[PDB]
Amino acid sequence: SSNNFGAILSPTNVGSNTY
Amino acid sequence: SSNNFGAILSPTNVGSNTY
Amino acid sequence: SSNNFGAILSPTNVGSNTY
Amino acid sequence: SSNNFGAILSPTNVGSNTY
Amino acid sequence: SSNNFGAILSPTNVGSNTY
Amino acid sequence: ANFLVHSSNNFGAILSPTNVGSNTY
Amino acid sequence: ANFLVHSSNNFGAILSPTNVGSNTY
Amino acid sequence: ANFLVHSSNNFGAILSPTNVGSNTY
Amino acid sequence: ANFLVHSSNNFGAILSPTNVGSNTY
Amino acid sequence: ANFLVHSSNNFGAILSPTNVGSNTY
Amino acid sequence: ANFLVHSSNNFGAILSPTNVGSNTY
Amino acid sequence: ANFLVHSSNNFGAILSPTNVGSNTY
Amino acid sequence: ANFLVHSSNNFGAILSPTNVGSNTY
Amino acid sequence: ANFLVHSSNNFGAILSPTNVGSNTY
Amino acid sequence: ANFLVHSSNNFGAILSPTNVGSNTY
Structure with missing residues (x-):
């Protein structure tokens, strides 16, 4: 959600975005 | 939510964004 | 909420944003 | 809320934002 | 979601985007 | 000499x- | 000499x- | 010499x- | 020489x- | 020489x- | 190697x- | 290696x- | 390695x- | 390593x- | 390591x- x-x-950003 | x-x-940011 | x-x-920020 | x-x-901030 | x-x-970004 | x-x-x-009128957003 | x-x-x-009028936001 | x-x-x-009038926000 | x-x-x-009038916020 | x-x-x-008048906030 | x-x-x-140079905008 | x-x-x-240089805006 | x-x-x-340099704005 | x-x-x-330098604004 | x-x-x-230097504002 x-x-x-x-x-x-x-x-x-360094880690994966995943948006 | x-x-x-x-x-x-x-x-x-350093950790994963996930927005 | x-x-x-x-x-x-x-x-x-250092930890994951998650917004 | x-x-x-x-x-x-x-x-x-150091900990996760989560806004 | x-x-x-x-x-x-x-x-x-450095990690995989995956949006 | 305006722009x-x-x-x-x-x-x-x-x-x-x-909206119902003219918009240019 | 204005701009x-x-x-x-x-x-x-x-x-x-x-809105119903003209907007340019 | 204004701008x-x-x-x-x-x-x-x-x-x-x-709003109903003109807005430019 | 104003700006x-x-x-x-x-x-x-x-x-x-x-609002109903002109706003530029 | 004002600005x-x-x-x-x-x-x-x-x-x-x-508000109903002009605002620029 | 280089990125x-x-x-x-x-x-x-x-x-x-x-401009005379490479303003690169 | 380099990023x-x-x-x-x-x-x-x-x-x-x-401008004469590379203002890069 | 480098970021x-x-x-x-x-x-x-x-x-x-x-400007003569690289103001980079 | 470096961030x-x-x-x-x-x-x-x-x-x-x-300006002559890199004001970087 | 370094942040x-x-x-x-x-x-x-x-x-x-x-300015002559890097005022970085």
């Missing part, structure tokens, strides 16, 4:  |  |  |  |  | 827009 | 906008 | 905007 | 804005 | 704004 | 760029 | 950039 | 940038 | 930047 | 920055 409605700017 | 409606700027 | 309506600026 | 309506600036 | 409705700008 | 530039850059998600 | 630049950069999420 | 720049950068989430 | 810059940077969340 | 800069940086949460 | 990325994204308006 | 990223994002208005 | 990120985001207005 | 992040965000107005 | 973050956020107005 993970919902992301807003804008995301520069999500630097 | 995780909902993110706002803007997120530069979310640097 | 986690809801985030406001803007978030530079959320540096 | 965790609701965050205000802006958050530089939330440095 | 991973849903991403918002725009994502520059998601630099 | 005119419009940049309506929309990034957020919009749920159920019930 | 005119409009930058309506929208990033937040909008729920149920019930 | 004119508008930067309406919106980041917050808006719930139920019931 | 004019407008920076309406909105970050907070707005619940139920019932 | 003019407006920085209306809003960070707080606003509940039920019932 | 170099040079991503350049632009959204804002650019008025009268006087 | 270098140079991301440049721009949203604001740029007026009259006088 | 270097150089993210540059800009939202504000820039008026008359006189 | 270096250089994030630069700007929201305010910059008037007449006279 | 270094250099976040620079700016909201205020900057007037006439005379």
